[PDB]
């Protein structure tokens, strides 16, 4: 650069007083000259002194641009594709290119199978997407995406890094741009990149694209079906934190569609491992992606509980405290692991052995976080399934807190919340109370709380699910005469009779059972049940 400094003012001024000529020839339409014109202009664009002169004139830039998207001579389309590349190294050059409509011309050059042409074309569009504003919506109009995605198969990691990023910039904040990429086999092409290349920058830029795509409702399936979950799961162990986090962001985003996915053993194993990692965002994405992957999947449930996942989740709830960003997903994941899988009875016990009762129960006292309360109630119900939890739960005063939630939610209900309906809370509490009322000592507390009148009312509910858990808690409650007397006196004797016709044989059974216990030391009921054709 020392020589170019010496004759700098000469070179600059010499090139300036040669623009009209260079613009003249370059415009003079007969390739033999034009090609030789873009050749010398290409050489001038290699020096700073003359490069800035070239970008300074709108005429030359417009001339080069036009010549580019016309010529078919590789030499010419390579000679004009390299000047623009050069000029794009300057904000004034980017702006000139942009205004000359260089974007469409450059998009057209994304057809050529030639290294040079392709390399110059992409690095120049990249520079337009990184700096020159208004370029994004300009490239989308030039159908750039459609010509960039078929480029994802070129065997050049450096080239791929740039191309992927271009997609990222174009895809971000644009719902429509995301859909186009899908139509062109974007997900599969990107997910192949993740399985094949080791280049960390390409993996990272690519993971960022996958991140932006995973938010699209229609892209999610496409990425998971192509093996996105597994391909990103392999990169959770990388030595590049920025890569691990981009993959986690994506896995968490896709996790609501992978609940039926295949061979995710290694991924789950390290997701549970990441529940101990100190990095908060990691802990939060891993705890989130786990709550989703264990949704109605006995296999995942079993494998997760089989890798110290229950213990891992409780330790995450303890480190998180008032963070509903971690606690909620973690309580959902625990409720999942404690129900409907071969190892559920096991997880129900480990939560107690690992002192989760204290931490979990306390979560019932969260202010404007209903989703966490609803989730915790459900978790409590599952835990109440295990007979060994009946005491631990009464220790944490769950029965009081539950009936408090119950009464409140019943007032607001009889009257007429982050998507949480109060109707579901009545069911939740009554449902947990129905299970907790299996333990005798718990029946006393429930009966001392004067909850019978309430339960008897719920029998009138239109909600089937409500009537069932209601007639259930009464059922197990009438097991004792003292409580039964109250139930009889409250006028429950009638509604149960009309529940015997419930198409839900479950609640129907509960109804019958109650009636059979409230006439213990007090036949007309038996006739009603037997002597009925329908």
């Amino acid at each position: 650069a020392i020589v170019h400094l010496i004759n700098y003012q000469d070179d600059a001024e010499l090139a300036t007083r040669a623009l009209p000529e260079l613009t003249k020839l370059l415009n003079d339409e007969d390739p033999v000259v034009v090609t030789k014109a873009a050749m010398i202009v290409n050489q001038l664009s290699k020096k700073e002194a003359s490069r800035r002169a070239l970008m300074g004139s709108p005429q030359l830039v417009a001339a080069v641009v036009r010549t580019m998207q016309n010529t078919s001579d590789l030499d010419t389309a390579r000679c004009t594709t390299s000047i623009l590349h050069n000029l794009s190294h300057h904000r004034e050059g980017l702006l000139a290119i942009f205004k000359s409509g260089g974007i469409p011309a450059l998009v057209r050059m994304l057809s050529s199978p030639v290294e040079s042409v392709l390399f110059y074309a992409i690095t120049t569009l990249h520079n337009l997407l990184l700096y020159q504003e208004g370029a994004k919506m300009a490239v989308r109009l030039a159908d750039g995406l459609q010509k960039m995605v078929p480029l994802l198969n070129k065997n050049n990691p450096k080239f791929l890094a740039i191309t992927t990023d271009c997609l990222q910039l174009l895809a971000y904040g644009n719902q429509e741009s995301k859909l186009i990429i899908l139509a062109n086999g974007g997900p599969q092409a990107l997910v192949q990149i993740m399985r094949n290349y080791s280049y960390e920058k390409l993996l990272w830029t690519t993971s960022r694209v996958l991140k932006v795509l995973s938010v699209c409702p229609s892209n999610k399936p496409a990425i998971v079906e192509a093996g996105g979950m597994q391909a990103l799961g392999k990169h959770l162990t990388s030595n590049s934190p920025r890569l691990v986090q981009n993959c986690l962001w994506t896995l968490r985003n896709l996790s609501d569609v992978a609940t039926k996915q295949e061979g995710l053993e290694s991924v789950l194993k390290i997701l549970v491992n990441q529940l101990s990692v100190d990095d908060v965002n990691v802990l939060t994405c891993a705890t989130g992606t786990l709550s989703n992957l264990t949704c109605n999947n006995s296999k995942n449930k079993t494998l997760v509980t089989q890798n110290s996942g229950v213990e891992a989740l409780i330790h995450a709830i303890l480190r998180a405290g008032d963070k509903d960003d971690i606690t909620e997903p973690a309580v959902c994941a625990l409720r999942h692991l404690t129900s409907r899988h071969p190892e559920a009875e096991m997880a129900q016990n480990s939560v107690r052995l690992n002192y989760g009762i204290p931490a979990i129960v306390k979560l019932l006292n969260q202010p404007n976080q209903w989703p966490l309360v609803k989730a915790t109630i459900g978790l409590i119900r599952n835990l109440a399934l295990c007979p060994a939890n009946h005491a631990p739960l009464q220790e944490a005063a769950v029965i009081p807190r539950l009936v408090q939630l119950l009464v409140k939610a019943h007032q607001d209900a009889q009257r007429h919340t982050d998507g949480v309906r109060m109707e579901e809370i009545v069911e939740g509490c009554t449902g947990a109370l129905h299970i907790l009322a299996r333990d005798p000592m718990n029946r006393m507390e429930i009966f001392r709380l004067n909850t019978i009148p309430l339960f008897v009312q719920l029998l009138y509910s239109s909600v089937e699910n409500i009537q069932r858990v209601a007639a259930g808690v009464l059922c197990e409650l009438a097991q004792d005469k003292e409580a039964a007397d109250a139930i009889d006196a409250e006028g429950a004797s009638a509604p149960l009779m009309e529940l015997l016709h419930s198409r839900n044989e479950g609640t129907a059974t509960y109804a019958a059972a109650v009636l059979f216990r409230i006439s213990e030391d007090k036949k007309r009921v038996s006739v009603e049940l037997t002597n009925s054709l329908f």
Binding site: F119, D165, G173, K211, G472, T509
Partner: protein, 91 residues
Amino acid sequence: VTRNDVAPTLMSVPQYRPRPANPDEIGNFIDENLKAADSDPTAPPYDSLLVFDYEGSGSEAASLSSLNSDQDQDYDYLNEWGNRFKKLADM
């Protein structure tokens, strides 16, 4: 964030015993069918989903390696291009 409950998948529904015609077996009937009910896997709580959609924060690509050196640049070729290039040769 949108939250959705998922009804239990392929869970074994509780099968109940037909109703007896005699009163003396009505107790046993209730007991038998009570056990099916108390173990209903189709009954709540249902597992839930939490549809995440973190679309990043529009970070900018940090220093990606370029795909493309100070050689000698002399315009000797200009002298052998006939007519309209002698203008550039003068410069």
